[PDB]
Amino acid sequence: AMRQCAIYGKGGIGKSTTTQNLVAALAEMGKKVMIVGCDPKADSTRLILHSKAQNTIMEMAAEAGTVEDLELEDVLKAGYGGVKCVESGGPEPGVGCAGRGVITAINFLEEEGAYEDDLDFVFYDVLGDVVCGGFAMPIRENKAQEIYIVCSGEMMAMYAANNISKGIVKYANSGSVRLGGLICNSRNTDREDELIIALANKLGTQMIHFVPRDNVVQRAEIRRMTVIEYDPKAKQADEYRALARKVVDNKLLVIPNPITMDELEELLMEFGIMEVEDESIVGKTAE
Amino acid sequence: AMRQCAIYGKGGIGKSTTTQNLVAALAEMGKKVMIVGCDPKADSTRLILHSKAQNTIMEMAAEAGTVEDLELEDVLKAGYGGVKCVESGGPEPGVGCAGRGVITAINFLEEEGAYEDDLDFVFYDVLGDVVCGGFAMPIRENKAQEIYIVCSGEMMAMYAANNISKGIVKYANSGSVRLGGLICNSRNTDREDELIIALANKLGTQMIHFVPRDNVVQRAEIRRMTVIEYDPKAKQADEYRALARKVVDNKLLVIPNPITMDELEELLMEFGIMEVEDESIVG
Ligand SMILES: Nc1ncnc2c1ncn2[C@@H]1O[C@H](COP(=O)(O)OP(=O)(O)O)[C@@H](O)[C@H]1O
Ligand code: SF4
Ligand SMILES: [Mg+2]
Ligand SMILES: [Mg+2]
């Protein structure tokens, strides 16, 4: 029972933060994890291990020349709750695919054999920013089965999810890639709550959890580490833990179901967030 | 002497918009422009067309099964000012790639003689949200000369510019790719004005202009139209008009010179934004 989980989600939402704390519980619980920070953007492995920025496979492969010279012991960095930390690393810019990058990390890791051990989980942290080859990798490759879309009360977030869905679709008909559900993060939005719900439903999944916005977090980060770690007794902690059980316990893995644009348009409209439109279109006060 | 520029940057700043107001000025300004939407995220073409969404090639292609089919018309939509509007087409979700996607467009445009008809400008609607192999193409495949990053006083918007810069480099040595300036799209940040400048310098370029946040913007948007088209007699309308001015000229085409993280951090330190960092790490 070693579960191979990956998150997606656009960025700027909180994607990373969550997945970490979210692990932190998963640890407090009594399981074993290893985050595979596939985010160029975010610091998939930061709160845990406490250093602002870890070394990346690339950057290492970099300075040594090839995965060869990459001795595990350096890439792999022991964290909180014996938590697993390896940063895949972002493509040299202007030049390179993000697929190959990550892939590498995997063929590395499988090869330097990390997946072995005892571990309970494999958390691929990922960019839902744009669903392209590079990203579907762990998908396509089939290296991640259980996928959770970090969602939110936001039109992009919305949008991502959907692509990250067709994402899945293209392949589920192939292997075992499946979607646990979304995870509305709090964005103070009026009716987020329902909104995310509308999706999942529309889609074919649930909304595993919903994350309130509590200063504590912020306060947690600013400190460079988990919220768990900050004040396990803090409310939000139980906030997270929940989701942590929640996931363990998921038995709702599904072959998503992409929606139209249109449809997406309505919901936004309906729950009121993408304001109604008229056949105005002109003149500018000249009418 | 048709120029091949292209705008880049992070999604969610208005790029597509500011990009689009610009393109209009050029028009009010006599210039013959064409614009190639190569962003999956945004409204690249639109506001020239008053269309809910243009039909992308790669999207058009699919229908026939081939592009060899795809009829120019079907693909080149003529918007206000006579702005040749074309939209690349997304990276087919989960399976496929952007570069692969942009390309297709370009060949096809040349191949149908898009690039003739006496042109004054061509804008590439790019997305540096993550500049990888394939958001570089139009670079690497030297079809975009005149680069301008779109920035704004914020953490990843900047982060990216740098990166997006690093792109230009690589193709330094490759030659023919130079970064015009930046354009700060104000986010009401209290030292923005200042900040972006700071980058620019540390970077080694000029922040050509600083797009303000005049609600007269949206009011157009919401009408699927350019500020100009809208109220042309508008504080904003000039502001865009001032940008095309500075742009049909701007002769300082730098080779960038990228900064380090802390350098970066720092700036954000400097303005308070990413103010002081605590040394302690406990609870
Ligand atoms: N095409 C997309 N695919 C997946 N996620 C998307 C997409 N568009 C938006 N989302 C998310 O929204 C953000 C980018 O959109 P945004 O910042 O609004 O765009 P723009 O500059 O065109 O207005 C990213 O975090 C991205 O992941
Ligand atoms: S596969 Fe995707 S991320 Fe990689 S280079 Fe192509 S478009 Fe960019
Ligand atoms: Mg984040
Ligand atoms: Mg925009």
Chart the SSEs and their pairings:
Two copies of one chain form a homodimer.
Chain A: E1 3-7, H1 15-29, E2 34-37, H2 57-64, H3 72-75, E3 84-87, H4 98-111, E4 121-125, H5 133-142, E5 146-149, H6 155-172, E6 178-185, H7 192-203, E7 206-211, H8 216-221, H9 227-230, H10 235-248, H11 261-270
Parallel strand pairs in A: 1-4, 1-5, 2-3, 2-4, 5-6, 6-7
One magnesium ion binds at residues 14-17, 42 of chain B.
Structure in words:
2 copies of one chain form a homodimer. Chain A has 287 residues and is α/β, with parallel strands linked by helices. Chain A has one domain (1-287): Rossmann fold (3-Layer(aba) Sandwich). Helix content of chain A is 40%, strand content 13%. The first copy, chain A, has helices at 15-29, 57-64, 72-75, 98-111, 133-142, 155-172, 192-203, 216-221, 227-230, 235-248, 261-270, and strands spanning 3-7, 34-37, 84-87, 121-125, 146-149, 178-185, 206-211. In chain A, α6 (155-172) links the parallel β5 and β6. The longest helix of chain A has 18 residues, at 155-172. Chain A starts with a strand and ends in a 17-residue tail after the last helix. The relative contact order of chain A is 0.17. Chains A and B meet through α5 and α6 of A and α6 of B. Adenosine-5'-diphosphate sits between chains A (10-12, 128-131, 156, 159-160, 163) and B (11-13, 15-16, 39-42).
